[PDB]
Amino acid sequence: TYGIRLRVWGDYACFTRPEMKVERVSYDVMPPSAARGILEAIHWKPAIRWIVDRIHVLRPIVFDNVRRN
RNA sequence: GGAUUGAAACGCCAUGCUCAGGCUGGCGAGUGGGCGCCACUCUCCA
Numbered sequence: 001t002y003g004i005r006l007r008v009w010g011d012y013a014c015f016t017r018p019e020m021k022v023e024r025v026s027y028d029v030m031p032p033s034a035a036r037g038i039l040e041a042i043h044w045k046p047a048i049r050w051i052v053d054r055i056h057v058l059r060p061i062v063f064d065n066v067r068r069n
Numbered sequence: 070g071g072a073u074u075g076a077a078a079c080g081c082c083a084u085g086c087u088c089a090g091g092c093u094g095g096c097g098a099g100u101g102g103g104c105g106c107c108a109c110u111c112u113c114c115a
């Protein structure tokens with residue numbers, strides 16, 4: 001009809017919660033802001049906008065720990 | 070061609086498992102036992 005469906009996947013992800021910025025803890029799920037950020041990486045011009053409608057989660061939830069300098 | 074609470078972000082520098090000590094003293098394989106009794110190379114052709 002209208003709009004687009006896109007699929008994305010990977011081994012690692014991190015959507016930092018605003019409160020835990022110093023000691024990063026990720027959201028349970030992608031937020032819309034990151035979704036918009038990704039789309040503009042394929043194509044964007046000053047003359048248009050992106051609007052997000054829905055998200056589909058296809059895998060279970062998992063957490064792991066990392067440390068760095 | 071503005072902006073993914075984003076764009077940048079080493080776990081790093083280095084440290085002997087070391088000095089030394091006997092498996093040793095010594096003990097019989099040894100006493101003695103029948104290979105024995107008896108058996109045809111033998112019957113022919115100048």
